[PDB]
Amino acid sequence: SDFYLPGDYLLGGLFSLHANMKGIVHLNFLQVPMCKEYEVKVIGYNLMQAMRFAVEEINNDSSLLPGVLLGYEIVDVCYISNNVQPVLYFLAHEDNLLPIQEDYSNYSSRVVAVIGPDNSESVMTVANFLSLFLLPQITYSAISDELRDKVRFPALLRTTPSADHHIEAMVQLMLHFRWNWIIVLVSNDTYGRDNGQLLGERVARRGICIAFQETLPTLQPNQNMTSEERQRLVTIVDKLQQSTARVVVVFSPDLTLYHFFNEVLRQNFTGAVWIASESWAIDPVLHNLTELRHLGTFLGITIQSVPIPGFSEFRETCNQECDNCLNATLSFNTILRLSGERVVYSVYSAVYAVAHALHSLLGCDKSTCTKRVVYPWQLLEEIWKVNFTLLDHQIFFDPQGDVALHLEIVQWQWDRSQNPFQSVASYYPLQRQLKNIQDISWHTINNTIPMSMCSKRCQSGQKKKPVGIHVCCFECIDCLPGTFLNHTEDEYECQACPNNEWSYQSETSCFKRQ
Amino acid sequence: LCLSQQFKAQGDYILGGLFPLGSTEEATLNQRTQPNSIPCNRFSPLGLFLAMAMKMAVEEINNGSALLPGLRLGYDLFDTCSEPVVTMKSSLMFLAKVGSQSIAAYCNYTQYQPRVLAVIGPHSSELALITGKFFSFFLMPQVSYSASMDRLSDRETFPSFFRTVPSDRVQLQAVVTLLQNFSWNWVAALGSDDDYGREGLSIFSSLANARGICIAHEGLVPQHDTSGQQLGKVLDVLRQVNQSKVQVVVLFASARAVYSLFSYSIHHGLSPKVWVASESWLTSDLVMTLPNIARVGTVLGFLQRGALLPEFSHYVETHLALAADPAFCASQRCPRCDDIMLQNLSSGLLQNLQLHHQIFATYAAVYSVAQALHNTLQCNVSHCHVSEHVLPWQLLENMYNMSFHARDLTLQFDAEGNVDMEYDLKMWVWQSPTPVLHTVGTFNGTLQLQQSKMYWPGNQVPVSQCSRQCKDGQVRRVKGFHSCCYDCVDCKAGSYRKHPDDFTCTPCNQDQWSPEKSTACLP
């Protein structure tokens, strides 16, 4: 099957080919959780084929690893379910026994590196093992900031910007279009609340008011809902429709949204700007509910596009098989083909980073490498130092373990035969700025920028007085005759005319009296 | 002394232990570059006492026939070293095959024997998460003597974690019941700028919103007095609380943080308030150093209660004396436990220890597993069905429904793994030159107050209500950190209120007129 290739050195892979939002985490009848039964996830299979393509190139290329067969072995981690055991499998000797030695400096696992899971909790659950062995791990899509503490996680690297930069991109997008008044929706798991609180700590200082925050229920798409969950969803949608804030930011796993949006459609809702976090800003499955085009404008922050030449043509000891993947992906293959690679590039660049690290560690020369016994902890030390161009892009690691790839904002477009997720703007983290915003097409009557603000700007001579806690909300009151609005010094209080002067009803200054 | 040899005992069934029995110096806090063993050469006293409590519990169980007749209960202990890597090494050791130092990566485990029956878990919530996600995969029952963080009660991610202490949610349920019973509906909340205080605020705000208590103001406080970033905020919150017109405030922080703020107040004459304290602050010794604390106002809080062991000190000293005998050898885990002498380990340390209840919780923990084994073997008064060797998941099957005894106290695990044990309510009297934490009630699921014993500075009950209802003629002007309450505004003459469910008054017409508070205009 696809899941194994022999070689002189093996990479480990952990991809979420199957997924369920409440999978079983423990041994089931004292047997490892069998991944096959949690439906299927085509995106994960795409990323797995990205890794396979990277390794095929690295073996085919006579220059990067001359005379060394780079192998791999893959295990699918069904979201948070079936962690642990893949790690024990990678770490154990060829007889599947892991000895508990006092010191591992001389130890030799199955694999020299792990292309780590796609999710923060899974990444931590694997890292707390691999840190023991200092066996290098590179994760392609886990954005949590906690993963930047090298003391806690010394073996962990990333090929994606941290959550800080996604939140900064969101807030700078809001500032550009002057959206002072927003709604935030979060899932009930750690991703949602962590990102929601992180956005909370950001939105306040820049001067944007979070109208309210709401926890989405963790529903399951292939499971019919109860009436109680339907009541909760109806309540959420009615909270949306009742509000003046028409900008909605969504922090949730992708699977929990299928029901949500369905209900949003059944409630005859329309007219809002939806801002998607990286978890679902790209989603072939959710994009296919084409009636979404009537809800409003769909924007999302995601990894930048980097077209991989020839990848789409290439795409044409338990938990190592998938029956559903091929027939499932053949239904999406067309809509996938038009979408340039974004996260696939994260996987591809991670594999190439390990490839260069190993190429250096073996003391290799373009004639041949000097094969040896690579203890993983040496390969980690070499991985920290790599620096090279892959496709016109320099990839190298921060002192804190991240690659400084750009972020990109994408609008969803429903005209087929062209890119489903079209670029609208580009964000640079090492400059921490959003730039090059292009022509977004809005749902509005004549394509005017949609707006959401708690208040209209007051007239001249009219001071503000706050309402509620939200600083964005205020009432406008005129400075009465004899007083005036010195807006150059204060917007919230008036000043009084000198003795020889007096002021009209609604003016910033005083006229000289009789 | 022979002390480190005494941390391993043979028996038919064996319990693992993780204790703060060692540590390492600041020099060891570097980023690692080679997987060498950690130098846990920095001794710590508390872990020794907790381990001795476990040893005493096992000795009691092995002496008396009341539990597990005819078979021996054993153990071997490892130190967490307060270090995730060392904790993980020990946890990996616990699950190795019987008689071998290696762990298997098999597909199934229907006939697989780990080398311990249960693990008495780590001392901290961080290590409790880190190890609970590992032990629960194998369905190994882990019983923690002190990990109060809420998240670990989740049966979905932690199907085998148990603890013999209440969670933070229980303490804050007690606090919210106190707030409800005196109708202190409008309050402020503070937390220390560490994970403890942020989690305290996270729990309290959710509980308060759920029960209709309205939070006027949320803030945080530093537990230091060393930087401008701390000084500015600690004075800022003091201004803001006064401006909110609040009278009752809850603080979830360590002692220093709170009295630091009070000290600043004492300098600049803050108004009196009612303060509700977490026990980590309510412990009064260092706080009473303030020379004019009477300016603060009433302070209340809840404190855990349990039957302390009456003979632990004698046992500790006796077995240390035995460990000093060179012949006792006829009877590494810690580089230095063998050399720390009796004199400096004398009773003064365990008398200084206010954490005496954690000595109980470590004791109770052992019994919970022992009883669970006693039930699992379906033991008679004088027999046990030892025909088969029990495995951890069969123990796990028997623990969610049990009741067990620890000295006079009796306990049960609930469906999410916590034990239920009561709290005292104590009020912080300063009026006597010798201050007193006077008991004024208890919480056992219902707040049994004893009203006649309450102290108030003016012999009057404080009140901090807010108007969640308004008159027919009044506008409901919203307020609060969340929009849960209103302050009523009388509708001014010349305007009409309309129906009271609407929220704004409107001018009357030219031919009309209206007095104050009118719903509609007269002609």
Residue numbers in the entry:
A (entry chain A): 25 to 340, 358 to 555
B (entry chain B): 23 to 353, 367 to 388, 392 to 561
Give me lines lifted from the publication on this model.
In the presence of sweeteners, the human/mouse sweet receptor adopts two distinct conformations, which we refer to as compact and loose. In the presence of sucralose, we observed a prominent ligand density in the TAS1R2 VFT domain, consistent with previous functional studies showing that sucralose binds exclusively to TAS1R2.3,12 The VFT LB1 and LB2 form a clamshell-like structure, and sucralose adopts a U-shape that fits snugly within the cleft between the lobes. Its chlorinated fructose and glucose rings are oriented nearly side by side, in a vertical arrangement, allowing multiple polar interactions with residues lining the interlobe pocket: the chlorine interacts with Asn143; the hydroxyl and chlorine groups participate in a H-bonding network with polar residues including Asp142, Asp278, and Glu302. Thus, the loose state shows the highest degree of TAS1R2 VFT closure, whereas the compact state may correspond to an intermediate along the activation trajectory. The closure of the TAS1R2 VFT clamshell induced by sweetener binding leads to the formation of salt bridges between LB1 Lys65 and LB2 Asp278, which are brought into proximity in the compact state and engage further to form stable interactions in the loose state. It interacts with the region surrounding Tyr131 and Phe159 of TAS1R3, pushing against an adjacent loop near Thr179, which is displaced by ~2 Å.
Sugars and other sweet-tasting compounds are detected by the sweet taste receptor, a member of the class C GPCR family. The sweet receptor is a heterodimer composed of TAS1R2 and TAS1R3,3,4 two type 1 taste receptor family members that share the distinctive architecture of class C GPCRs: a large extracellular Venus flytrap (VFT) domain, responsible for ligand recognition; a cysteine-rich domain (CRD); and a seven-transmembrane (7TM) domain that mediates G protein coupling. To address this gap, here we present cryo-electron microscopy (cryo-EM) structures of the sweet receptor in the inactive, unliganded state, as well as in the activated, sucralose- and advantame-bound states. Unlike other class C GPCRs, such as mGluR, CaSR and GABAB receptors, where agonists stabilize inter-subunit VFT interactions to promote activation, the sweet receptor is activated by the rearrangement of a TAS1R2 VFT loop, which destabilizes interactions between the lower VFT lobes and the VFT–CRD interfaces.
